[PDB]
Amino acid sequence: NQYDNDVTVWSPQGRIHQIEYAMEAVKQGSATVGLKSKTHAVLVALKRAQSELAAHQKKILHVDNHIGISIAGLTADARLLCNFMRQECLDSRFVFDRPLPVSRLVSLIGSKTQIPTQRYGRRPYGVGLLIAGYDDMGPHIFQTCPSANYFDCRAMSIGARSQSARTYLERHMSEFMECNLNELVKHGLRALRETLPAEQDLTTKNVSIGIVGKDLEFTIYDDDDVSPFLEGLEERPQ
Amino acid sequence: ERGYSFSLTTFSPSGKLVQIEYALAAVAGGAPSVGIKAANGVVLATEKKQKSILYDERSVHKVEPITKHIGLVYSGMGPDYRVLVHRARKLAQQYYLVYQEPIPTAQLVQRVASVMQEYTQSGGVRPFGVSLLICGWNEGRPYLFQSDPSGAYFAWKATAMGKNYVNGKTFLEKRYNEDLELEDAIHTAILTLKESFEGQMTEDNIEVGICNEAGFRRLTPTEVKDYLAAIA
Amino acid sequence: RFSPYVFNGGTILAIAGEDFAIVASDTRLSEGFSIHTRDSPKCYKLTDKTVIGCSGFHGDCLTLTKIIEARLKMYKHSNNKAMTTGAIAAMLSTILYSRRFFPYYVYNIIGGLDEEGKGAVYSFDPVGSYQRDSFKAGGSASAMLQPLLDNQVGFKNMQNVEHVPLSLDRAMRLVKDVFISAAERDVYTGDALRICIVTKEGIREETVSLRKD
Amino acid sequence: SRRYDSRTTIFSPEGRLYQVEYAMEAIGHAGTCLGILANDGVLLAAERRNIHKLLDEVFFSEKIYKLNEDMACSVAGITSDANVLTNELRLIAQRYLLQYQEPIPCEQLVTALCDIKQAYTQFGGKRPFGVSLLYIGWDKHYGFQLYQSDPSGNYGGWKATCIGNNSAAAVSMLKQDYKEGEMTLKSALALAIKVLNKTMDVSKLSAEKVEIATLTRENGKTVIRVLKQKEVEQLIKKHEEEEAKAEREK
Amino acid sequence: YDRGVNTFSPEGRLFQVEYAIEAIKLGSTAIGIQTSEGVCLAVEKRITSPLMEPSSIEKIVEIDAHIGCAMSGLIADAKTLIDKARVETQNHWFTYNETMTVESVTQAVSNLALQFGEEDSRPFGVALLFGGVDEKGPQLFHMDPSGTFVQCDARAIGSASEGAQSSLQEVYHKSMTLKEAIKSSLIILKQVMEEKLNATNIELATVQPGQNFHMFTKEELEEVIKDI
Amino acid sequence: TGYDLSASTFSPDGRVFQVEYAMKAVENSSTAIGIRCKDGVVFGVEKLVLSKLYEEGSNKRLFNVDRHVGMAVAGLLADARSLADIAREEASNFRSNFGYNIPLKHLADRVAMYVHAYTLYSAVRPFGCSFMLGSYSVNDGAQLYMIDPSGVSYGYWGCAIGKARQAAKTEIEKLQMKEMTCRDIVKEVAKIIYIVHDEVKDKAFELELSWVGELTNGRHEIVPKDIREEAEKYAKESLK
Amino acid sequence: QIHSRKMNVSPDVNYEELARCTDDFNGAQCKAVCVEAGMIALRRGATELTHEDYMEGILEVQAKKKANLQYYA
Amino acid sequence: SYDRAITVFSPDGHLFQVEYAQEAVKKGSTAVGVRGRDIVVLGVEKKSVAKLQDERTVRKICALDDNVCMAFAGLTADARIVINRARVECQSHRLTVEDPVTVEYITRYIASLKQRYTQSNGRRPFGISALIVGFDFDGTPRLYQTDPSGTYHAWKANAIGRGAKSVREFLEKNYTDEAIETDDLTIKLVIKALLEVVQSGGKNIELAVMRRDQSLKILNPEEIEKYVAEIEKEKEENE
C-alpha cells in the first residue's frame, strides 16, 4: 500500500484512495434525509450523543435567510466550510444587494474544496453537506462529497446505513412532488424510521427539521416544535 | 519553490560527504586538461574530441575569458560549466563597478569558491560536477588557481585534471621546472595532453589559450596548426 | 481640486420615551442649490427593536448601513441571538474610529429599546464618540431643534413647571411641530417626514407630508 | 516529497544527537592544531595537509586567517565552509566596530559564531557546519586568550588547545609537560616543536610541513607575527640538539 | 513507516487526532457537574514528590470573571489555548460591551483546535472542561482535540473516566443541589485516585449566579473533606 | 518498485507512470464524442441513470466557457470544473486585453500549458480529465480540439472520450464532413450514441447534445432537445 | 441470489439494496456475505434469514478495524 | 522555509521528541538547589574539568537580572540560546513596568517559548532543563524548574541531571526543617547532598548563593573546602 499514503499519488488502478477514505469518513456520520416538493424543500437529520447525560450533537445549522445545510462527518471542517459559506453569502449580499442563487454558491464550494484535494500535504475535507435553498426558480436539494462532485437531486440521504432511506425514497418519489409541508416532513422522518433498528426511534430527542418556504425563512426545529410533527404516525410492521 | 529547502547532503557514518566524493568521481570521468604557469605567462590546454566527423569546432568553446586578462577552463560537465561561468561573469562586473579596477584572480577564486561552497550546503540541490583551472596576469606575477566540487581551491605551478590526471601529474613532476618561456610551456602542455589522448591530434582536437602580462589571448586553430609541427 | 466630500444635509430626530423610541427624518437628498429627489428616507430598520438614522454625506451613509446590517447578520450567525442596543453602539463606535485617518462625514443617531424595555437614544459624532441621551437632533437643522426639545422635553430654564412623563401622542405632535417650524427656516428640510416608532410590539412607520417648497 | 527527506535534525533513539557526532568525526580527520598561551604572547601551530611539491605558497597566509587587527583563527575540517564562516565572522567583528568604534572583545565574537552554528543545528534539516576552529586574540579586560569552537555551538576557553584526532595524545603531552605561566617565547616554541615532533608521525618534522604564527603585545601596533621559515629551521635544529642532550640520561 | 501527518485512515478517521484522543488518556482525571444553583467542578493534582510544592500546580485556571475552566494531560498546550481564549473574550466584551457566552468561547477555540499543518503543527493534546454562568443559566461544556464540541451535564474525563461516568450516572439526576454535588464529586475522586485524600490533593471551582465569581481558597476544602 | 510514486520521476524505460495511470483514469468514464460539420460542431454526452440519484439537469458535462466555446468533458468531474473555470478566466483575460473573441488555438494552447505545468512537479498531481473544445467563427470556420491528461492538444474532425472509444469512432469515420449540415449530424450522433453502450451494466441512460455553429449565429448553447426530439424517433428504429 | 439458494431465505430481502451497498466487492466476498449472514442469523438461533442479517454480514465482510469511532456527526 | 512537522504524536499517545529529549537532560551534569528562608543556595556538580585550564567560560550558573539566577542541565548550547532570549525578555519587561522582574514571569516566558518551540514547524525541541531561583518582592524565596515539555513547576529542592533519583532520595530522607534554620547549615546541606552525589572532590563543586538583598556571589573554592572539612568532621562526630 505504498500508493495509499498521499493525495498526490495516482493508483495503478487510477483510484486515488485518499478520496475513497474521505468517502468512508462521510459514511460514519449520522443518518440524514433531504427531499423537496415543487414549493417546499425539507431536510431532516438524526442526532446522536456521546453518553446519556450529555446533550445531542446538533446537525442542522443556519446559513442565510433561505439557505440551510445539513452535515455529516467531522465538525472542524464543517464549521470551516460553514464560515466560508456565510462569508460568501454575505459578500454578494453586500455587493449586489440581492440573495445568492444556490448553484453558483455550490460551484464556489467545489472550487474551494478542489485545492486541498490536488496539492501535496493537504487533506480532502471530510464533509457531508446537504444543501436546501431558494433561488428565484424554486427549491434545490444539493449534496456534496469530499471529491467536490456536487449533485442536484430530488431526494438524497447520506450517513450511516442510509441506503434503506434511498429505497424508501424511490417508492415515494412520485408522491413527493404534489404535497404540502406536513406529509412531506413526515415522509422524511419515515425515511428516518427505517434508517434505524426496530426498537428505538425518535422520541423527541434526536431529530431536527429545517423547512424553507416561499414566504418562510429557513428555520430549525428541535424536539418541541417537533412534537407537533411527530404525531400523525403509525407503527412499524411485524 | 515548494517549501522543502532541505539539504540532500548528509555526512557519512564515518564522516564523509558522499555526494562530494561522487562529484569528484564525476569530475574524474571527464575530458582531460592541463595548465602550466611559466614565469611570463600561463598556458591552459584542453582535449576536445568530436564524437563523429560531423561535428563543428567553431560552436562550442572550452577556453573562455572572464575579463580581458583572466582565462578559465574546466574538466567535467559543460552544462554546469557554462552556468558557473556566467555567474563568474556577473560577479566580476560588480567588482569592476565598485572599485573601477580589474578584479584580481585571487578575489575571483574567493568569491566563486564561496558561491560553489554555499551552493553545496543549500537545500535540495546537487553539487556541481566541475573542476576549474583559473588563471590571469594580475600585478606582474601571473597566477593559476584550481578549484573543485567541494568548494576548495589551491594554487599550482603545473597541474592536470580529468582522465589520467595521475599519469599526467607524474609527467608534470618530472617535466616541469621553475623557469620556462611560453613556448616551452606550450611544448610540455601538448606533451602531457599527448600522453593520454588518441593518436590523431590536430588543430581541432586540442584548444589552447595563453595569458600575457599584456592581457589574455585566446589562440586560434591557425597557430595551433602551426604548433604541432615536430609535435609535442 | 477633487474634493472627496459633499454636504447632502438632512435632519434626524430622536426621542426616548418610557417604553418607546421615536426616530424621524426628512427625505430630501440635495446638493448645493439643487434637489436630487424628494423621497429618500434616512431611517433604517436594523432589528425588531432598533432603528438607525444616518445623515450627512450620502454614500458613507449607504456604506455604513450595509456594513452594520452585515455585522448584525454575523452576530446572529455566531451567537444565536440578536444584538442589544448598546452592543450596536459599541460596535458602531469601533467602526467609526476604524476609519479615523480618513473620516466618515456622517452624523449617526440610534434609537431603540433596551433589554428592560425602556427608551435609549445613542448619539454619535463623525469620529466615534457616543453617549446615552434622551433626545438628540442631528444634521443641518440641529441648532434649530435642540433648544426647543430642551424647552419641552427637558423642561429646562423654566420656573414652577412640573415634570410630567412624556406620553406618546404628545411626542407625536411635538415631532410634527418641530419639523414644520424647522422647515420654515431651513433649506434642507424635506417634504416627506418619515416617522418610525419602536414599541415593545414591533416597528410602526408613518408618512406625513409638509409644505412642498 | 517527504520520503526523500533526510532528517538531519531529529534526535537519535540512542539518546544523543546523530548528525552532530558524525560532524565531530568529520572534524577528527584532516587536521591538527594547537597553541600555547603562557604569557607575553600566544601562538598557533598547523600541519600542511597539501604538502605536495607543486604548489605556490603565494598567498602569504595558509590555515591562519587574520580576521581583525587583533585576532586570527586556525581551521580544521572542510575548508570552504570555514571560508563562509571567516567571511561572516570578519563581517560581524567589523560591524561591531562600526557600531561602537572600539575593537571587538573575543567572547562575544565567539558566541556570535556559536549562535550561527547552533542556528543551523536547531531547525530545518540543513547540513551542519563541519568546522571546528581556534581563536587567539587580545582585549581590554583579560589579555591573551584561547577558544575552542565545536560544531554544536558549544565553546570553551583553554590554555592549551586541541582540535584534530592526532592531537588527543598532544593534550596528554600538554598535561604531562604543563607549566604555570612560563612563556618566554622560546620555551613555548620549543614545547610546541616537541609536541608536533612527537604527535605527527612525520619523521624529523620537515619545516615546510608546519606552520607557526604568534601574536605579541605592542602599545600601538598589536602585531601578528606569521613568522617565516628560517627561524622554524633553526628552531628544529635547536630542538634536535636538545633531544640529543636529553638522551644523554640513558 | 512514516506517512504524511494529514492522512486519513483506511477505515476513515485520521491518524494524528485519534492518537491525540489516545494521548488524553494518560492524564489526570477531572469532574464537573452542572447544577441549576451553579456549576461545580473538581480535579486531581497528582502530587508526585514532597519536594514538589503543591499550591503551584494549576488545573483550574480563570478565563473570565465568570467563565471557568480545567485542563488535562499536557499542561502547556492547554496554557496557550487558555491565554488565547481569554484574549478573544476580552475582544468580545470590548467590541460589544457584553459577556461572550461560553458556547461562543468554545466555538472560538475549536475554530483552531484543528488548524494543524505545514503551511499557513501537530494537533493539540488537551481535553477541556468549560463552565460558567451566562444568560442561559449555568453551562457546562466539554471539547476535545478533534474540535468535536458538545454540551455535557456532568462529564468526567481522562484516565478514570469510565467508572467516573458510570458511577456518576448512578448518583446524578436533574434536581441536585450544590454541596450535595460537591461531595458527590469528591467521593468519586477518592474512589478513583491513588493517594490518600487530604488538604493538598484536590481543588474545587464553583461559579454561581448568586456566588457571582468562581472563588475557592484553601481550607474550606478542609471543612468539606471533614464532612465525609 | 519505487518508480510509480512521483509525477517528477522517470522510469527505467523512459516514461512517467503517473501520466499513464491518469490517462486510464478517464478510461472508466462514460463515452462522450464530438464531430464537426462544414458550418458547425456538434457535441453529445451519454449520461446514465442508475435509478433516481439526481434530477434531469444536474452536473451537465457540456459546459460553456466563452460565448462561442464550450466543453464536453469526461473523466474526473471536479477537476473538469476547475479547468473550465480556468478556461473562462483565460477567455476573460483575452477579451479584456485584446478586445475580441479568443481564437480556439490560443485557448487550447494556454489550457494545454496549464495541464502540462501540473505534470512537471511532485507537489501536484496530474489532471484526470480529457475534454473537447468546439467553436465557430466567420473568419475561422469550425475548429474541434481535444486535450488529454498529459497536455497533447491537437485537432480532429471527430473524436471520442470514455469507455467505448474505438467502437464510438468506428462509425464516426463512416460519416463525412463536407457534405453534411449539422442538423443531420444531430440525429446521427444521437442514433449512434443510442446504438453504442448497450443496456447491459447500466439500465437507463440519458442524452445531452451541445451545439454550436452558423445556425446559432455564432452562439453556443444546448439544443432544445425536447424540440424535434430527433434521437429517439429514429433510435427506436435503430434496433433492427 | 445464487448463493442464497440452499439457505431458507425469508422472502422479504431486497438484493438490490445489498448490491447497491456492497461497493467494490468480488463474487467471493458476496458469498462470504451470504454465508456470514446465515451464521449471524444462527447466533440468535432464528431459523430463516432476515434483511438485517445480510446488513450485519456486510458489516462483517467489510472488516472494519475500530477502535471505537463514535464521536462523529 | 521548512514546511514540516518534526514532532508527531505516537500511536500510543506520546510526543516522541518531548519525552525523548528528556534523555539528553538525563545524560548531563547534576545540579542541586534548595531554598532556605533568607539565603538561597544552588550549585552544580560534575564540572568534569581538565583541572589544568581556564574555568571562567564553562560557568553553568549565570543571571538574567540582579534579582534572578540560573542553573540548567542537558546540553549547554540550547541553554545559551534560552538565556540570551531570557535576558532580552527580562530587560524588555524592565522597559515597560518599573518593577524588578518577577521570577514567575520569566519562568512562564521560558516554558511558553519552549512549548511554542516544540509546537512549531520543524524546530527540534530544547533538550535542557533549567533552574530559576530568585526572591522577588517582600523577600520571598521561591524556586522553579523547567522541562523540555515546558512545564514551570515549583519545588522546594532539586533533582535533575545524572542520577537525580538518588539525590531526591537523599533529600527525601533529609527534608528536615532544621536544615533551613542556619544559612551556613543550608550551604552545608547543599554540600552534603552533592557529597551524596558524585566524586565531590571539592573541584567540580561549583556553588553560588544569594542572600536576597544582594547579587550572586560565586564562592572561592577554599571556603567550600572548609565546608567539606567540617562536614567530614560532623560525619566523624556521628560515630
Q: How far apart are CA B8 and CA B11, in angstroms?
A: 10
Q: How many domains does chain D have?
A: 1
Name the residue in chain B with its Cα closest to that of H3. B3
Q: How far apart are CA C96 and CA C75, in angstroms?
A: 18
Interchain CB contacts (distance < 8 Å): B and F: 3
Q: 3-class secondary structure for H76-143?
A: HHHHHHHHHHHHHHHHHHHHCCCCCCCHHHHHHHHHHHHHHHHHCCCECCCCECCEEEEECHHHCEEE
Q: How far apart are CA F45 and CA F208, in angstroms?
A: 5
Superfamily classification of domain B1-232: Aminohydrolase, N-terminal nucleophile (Ntn) domain (3.60.20.10)
SS3 B93: helix
* Residues preceding chain discontinuities in chain E with C to N over 2.5 Å: 120
- Write the DSSP assignment of A78-106 as a string of letters: HHHHHHHHHHHHHHHHHHTSSPPPHHHHH
Going by C-alpha positions, the residue among C140, C211, C188 that lies closest to residue C28 is C188
Q: Is the backbone peptide bond immediately before G67 cis, with ω within 30 degrees of 0? A: yes
Give the three cell numbers for residue A235: 407503527
Q: How many domains does chain F have?
A: 1
Residue type, position F189, single letter = V
Residue among A30, A163, A164 minimizing CB distance to G73: A30
Q: How far apart are CA F218 and CA F39, in angstroms?
A: 10
Paired residues of H69 in beta bridges: H133
Q: How far apart are CA A115 and CA A125, in angstroms?
A: 10
Distance of CA B164 to the CA centre of its chain: 16
* CA within 13 Å, CB half, C120: 19
Helices and strands of chain E, counted as H and E runs: 6, 7
Q: How far apart are CA F72 and CA F133, in angstroms?
A: 7
Going by C-alpha positions, the residue among D120, D118, D126 that lies closest to residue D7 is D126
- The H-assigned helical ranges of chain E are 16-23, 76-96, 102-110, 161-171, 178-192, 220-225
Going by C-alpha positions, the residue among F109, F196, F212 that lies closest to residue F161 is F196
Q: How far apart are CA F106 and CA F94, in angstroms?
A: 10
> Are A59 and G73 a contacting pair at CB < 8 A?
yes
Paired residues of C34 in beta bridges: C31
Is-contact H164 H180, C-beta < 8 A? no
Q: Is the dihedral of CA G18, G24, G27, G30 positive or negative?
A: negative
Residues of B in contact with F122 (CB under 8 A): 2
Q: How far apart are CA C137 and CA C186, in angstroms?
A: 14
Chain A residues 43-82 with a CB less than 8 Å from chain C: 62-63
Residues of H in contact with E19 (CB under 8 A): 9-13
Q: Which of F30, F55, F115 should we substitute to test contact with A (largest number of A Cβ atoms within 10 Å)?
A: F55
F8 touching chain B per CB within 8 A: no
User: Order of strands across the sheet with D210-215?
Assistant: D42-47, D210-215, D224-226
User: How close A193 gets to chain G, by Cα (Å)?
Assistant: 15
Give the three cell numbers for residue H142: 521561591
Name the residue in chain H with its Cα closest to that of E53. H155
Going by C-alpha positions, the residue among B137, B187, B204, B168 that lies closest to residue B75 is B168
Chain A residues 160-179 with a CB less than 8 Å from chain G: 161, 163-164, 166-167
- Other C-beta atoms closer than 10 Å to the C-beta of D124 total 22
The domains of chain E, with CATH numbers, are 1-228 (3.60.20.10)
Structure-determination approach: cryo-EM
Q: Which of H4, H8, H118, H143 should we substitute to test contact with E (largest number of E Cβ atoms within 10 Å)?
A: H8
Paired residues of A33 in beta bridges: A44, A157
Q: What are the angstrom distances between the C-alpha of F152 and each of F19, F112, F130, H222?
A: 12, 7, 10, 86
Q: Which domain holds residue F182?
A: 1-240
- Other C-beta atoms closer than 10 Å to the C-beta of A146 total 27
Residues of E in contact with C86 (CB under 8 A): 97-98
Q: How far apart are CA B101 and CA B91, in angstroms?
A: 14
Q: Which domain holds residue A55?
A: 1-238
SS3 D50: coil
Distance of CA E32 to the CA centre of its chain: 7
* CA within 13 Å, CB half, B98: 7
Q: Which of D3, D17, D20, D123 should we substitute to test contact with H (largest number of H Cβ atoms within 10 Å)?
A: D123
Is-contact H42 H167, C-beta < 8 A? no
Decide which of 3.30.360.10, 3.60.20.10, 3.40.50.11860, 1.10.10.10 is the CATH code for H1-239.
3.60.20.10
Residues F187-216 as b or e (16 or more Cβ within 10 Å = b): bbbbbbbbebbeeeeeeeeebbbbbbbbee
Residue written as grid cell 569552537: D149
Q: 3-class secondary structure for chain F?
A: CCCCCCCCCCCCCCCCHHHHHHHCCHHHCCCEEEEEECCEEEEEEEEEECCCCCCCCCCCCECCCECCEEEECEECHHHHHHHHHHHHHHHHHHHHHCCCCCCHHHHHHHHHHHHHHCCCCCCECCCCEEEEEEEEECCCEEEEEEECCCCCEEECCEEEECCCCCCCCCCCCCCCCCCCCHHHHHHHHHHHHHHCCCCCCCCEEEEECEEEECCCCCCEEECCCCCCCCCHHHHCCCCC
Residue written as grid cell 565545536: D150
User: How close H49 gets to chain E, by Cα (Å)?
Assistant: 30
- Write the DSSP assignment of H18-58 as a string of letters: HHHHHHHHHTS--EEEEE-SS-EEEEE------SSS--SS-
Give the three cell numbers for residue F66: 466563452
E53 touching chain H per CB within 8 A: yes
E22 touching chain G per CB within 8 A: no
Find all residues with CB under 8 Å of G18, minimum gap 6, and list them: G33, G54, G58
Q: How far apart are CA E86 and CA E109, in angstroms?
A: 10
E223 touching chain G per CB within 8 A: no
Distance of CA E70 to the CA centre of its chain: 3
Query: To 10 degrees, the CA torsion angle through B180, B185, B189, B192?
Result: -20
Give the three cell numbers for residue A141: 436539494
Residue among D55, D84, D126 minimizing CB distance to B123: D126
User: How close E100 gets to chain H, by Cα (Å)?
Assistant: 26
**Does A have 3 or more CB contacts under 8 Å with E?**
yes
Q: How far apart are CA H29 and CA H163, in angstroms?
A: 9
Residues of B in contact with H2 (CB under 8 A): 3-6
Q: How far apart are CA B123 and CA A156, in angstroms?
A: 51
**Does C have 3 or more CB contacts under 8 Å with E?**
yes
**Does C have 3 or more CB contacts under 8 Å with G?**
no
Residue type, position C185, single letter = R
Is-contact F129 F111, C-beta < 8 A? no
**Run of H or E residues at H189:** helix H183-195
E107 touching chain C per CB within 8 A: yes
Is-contact H227 H187, C-beta < 8 A? yes
Q: How many domains does chain A have?
A: 1
Residue among A6, A52, A76 minimizing CB distance to E113: A76
Residue written as grid cell 446559432: F216
SS3 B71: strand
User: How close H1 gets to chain B, by Cα (Å)?
Assistant: 5
> Are E110 and A52 a contacting pair at CB < 8 A?
no
Q: What angle do CA B168, B172, B174 make, to 5 degrees?
A: 120
CATH number for the domain spanning F137: value is 3.60.20.10
* Residues composing chain D: 250
Residue among H6, H75, H84 minimizing CB distance to D9: H6
- Other C-beta atoms closer than 10 Å to the C-beta of H17 total 19
**Does D have 3 or more CB contacts under 8 Å with B?**
yes
User: How close D248 gets to chain H, by Cα (Å)?
Assistant: 31
Interchain CB contacts (distance < 8 Å): E and H: 92
CATH number for the domain spanning A215: value is 3.60.20.10
What beta strand segments (E) does chain B contain? 33-38, 41-47, 64-67, 70-76, 130-137, 142-146, 158-161, 206-212, 215-218
Q: What are the angstrom distances between the C-alpha of H120 and each of E71, F24, H5, H116, H123?
A: 21, 41, 7, 6, 6
Query: To 10 degrees, the CA torsion angle through F168, F172, F174, F180?
Result: 150
Q: How far apart are CA D81 and CA D129, in angstroms?
A: 7
As to burial, measured by CB atoms within 10 angstroms (0-12 exposed, 13-18 middle, 19+ buried), residue E170 is exposed
SS3 H167: helix
Q: What are the angstrom distances between the C-alpha of D103 and each of A149, D41, D95?
A: 69, 19, 10
> Are B4 and H3 a contacting pair at CB < 8 A?
yes
Residue among F7, F27, F77 minimizing CB distance to A149: F77
Residues of E in contact with G63 (CB under 8 A): none
Q: What share of chain C is helix, strand, coil (3-state, %, to 5)?
A: 30, 30, 40
Find all residues with CB under 8 Å of G19, minimum gap 6, and list them: none
Q: How far apart are CA A42 and CA A192, in angstroms?
A: 13
Q: How far apart are CA H186 and CA H188, in angstroms?
A: 5
Q: How far apart are CA H151 and CA H126, in angstroms?
A: 13
Going by C-alpha positions, the residue among C31, C18, C3, C81 that lies closest to residue C188 is C31
SS3 C26: strand
User: How close A55 gets to chain E, by Cα (Å)?
Assistant: 6
Give the three cell numbers for residue B10: 548528509
Q: Angle, nearest 10°, between helix axes A181-194 and A163-170?
A: 140
Is-contact A44 A184, C-beta < 8 A? no
A38 touching chain G per CB within 8 A: no
Is-contact D55 B156, C-beta < 8 A? yes
Q: Is B170 left (phi over 0), alpha (psi -120 to 50) or beta?
A: alpha
Structure letter (DSSP) for residue C110: E
> Are H155 and E51 a contacting pair at CB < 8 A?
yes
F125 touching chain A per CB within 8 A: yes
Residue among A12, A107, A152 minimizing CB distance to F58: A152
Q: How far apart are CA H27 and CA H162, in angstroms?
A: 6
Q: Which of C76, C77, C79, C114 should we substitute to test contact with E (largest number of E Cβ atoms within 10 Å)?
A: C79
Q: How far apart are CA A140 and CA F55, in angstroms?
A: 10
Domain boundaries, chain B: 1-232
Find all residues with CB under 8 Å of F227, minimum gap 6, and list them: none
Q: What angle do CA A80, A83, A87 make, to 5 degrees?
A: 140
Name the residue in chain D with its Cα closest to that of H17. D11
The domains of chain C, with CATH numbers, are 1-213 (3.60.20.10)
Distance of CA D79 to the CA centre of its chain: 13
Name the residue in chain B with its Cα closest to that of D87. B114
User: How close A73 gets to chain E, by Cα (Å)?
Assistant: 9
User: How close A96 gets to chain C, by Cα (Å)?
Assistant: 11
SS3 D134: strand
Going by C-alpha positions, the residue among C191, C187, C182, C210 that lies closest to residue C33 is C187
Residue written as grid cell 602550466: B36
- Other C-beta atoms closer than 10 Å to the C-beta of E210 total 8
Q: Which domain holds residue D95?
A: 1-250
Residues D185-211 as b or e (16 or more Cβ within 10 Å = b): beebbebbbbbbbebbeeeebebeebb
Give the three cell numbers for residue H201: 572532590
Paired residues of C193 in beta bridges: C26, C208
As to burial, measured by CB atoms within 10 angstroms (0-12 exposed, 13-18 middle, 19+ buried), residue A179 is middle
List phi, psi (to 5°) of B89.
-60, -55
> Are G65 and E13 a contacting pair at CB < 8 A?
no
